[PDB]
């Protein structure tokens, strides 16, 4: 029993983290086979952040200008190119610790683990969700850029996020490993605006199922609802609409608990309309939306 915000084991990603220094800027790089991937703003300075010309900045850099270190060992850069907002540094040594991996672009509402790194060395691992407005609520300081987000399926690491920036909000934005930003953001210090965030309804429901599986059942009421009637209430509380696809995705949890999805929807409707009255669910006094249905099943095997 028990339910915790649980991250993937990070060992396969730890063996890929290197440090990239160009001038006075140092961030993290991802070393896979003979390529190091890192955010392109490693080539910027203070002169170069309102509106950097990255192609201009890059042409003035040699291979030798890129100092790449894997732990105590310098990796010689033999080629460099830019792909969207990431740099690809070809090095002369393939990483012997390269795991089986893929590059994936994740969807809003999906979750992943972040390995927070500074100077190429891991500091901590935590689980994050891609918010509907394409931000993440992470924990990143100066020098954390190039830290990656990932999921593991069996022996395969799916890299899906590389960290680039913090919005003045306190939320974070980055790219996939092809260097394309999630959301309408750009890697420059300009007035950009994150859209309004919403609550990921299918995730809240999955977490209510996790509560039931763990014996926290006080919120189950005797009612049912239609999907249309539920969504009218969800809309009022800034919850995402629940689709039939989401309903099907909750099938395994519904079967395990014997609670129909639309019956759980009726219980969530009452929690939204009435509050929790000082009670908790799985030790939380708020409804949690950063557990996907897959996350719940995986944890509650
Ligand atoms: C990379 O290591 C840093 C990590 C940031 C900065 C430190 C605090 N947390 C964090 O995640 N990334 C940067 O410094 C970027 C550099 C790019 C060339 C933009 N700059 C920012 O993240 C900057 N954000 C903005 O200027 C901005 C305006 C609108 C939206 O974002 C921060 C420092 C305010």
Swiss-Prot record:
Reactions catalysed, as given in the entry: TSAVLQ-|-SGFRK-NH2 and SGVTFQ-|-GKFKK the two peptides corresponding to the two self-cleavage sites of the SARS 3C-like proteinase are the two most reactive peptide substrates. The enzyme exhibits a strong preference for substrates containing Gln at P1 position and Leu at P2 position
Record note on what altering residue 142 to A does: Does not affect ability to cleave and inactivate human TRMT1
Domain of life: Viruses
Listed result of changing residue 90 to R: In strain: Beta/B.1.351
Cytoplasmic membrane side: 1-301
Subcellular compartments: Host cytoplasm; Host Golgi apparatus; Host nucleus
Chain residue numbers at which the record places covalent cross-link Glycyl lysine isopeptide (Lys-Gly) (interchain with G-Cter in ubiquitin): 5, 90
Protein name in UniProt: 3C-like proteinase nsp5
Location of this fragment in the whole protein: 3264 to 3564 of 4405
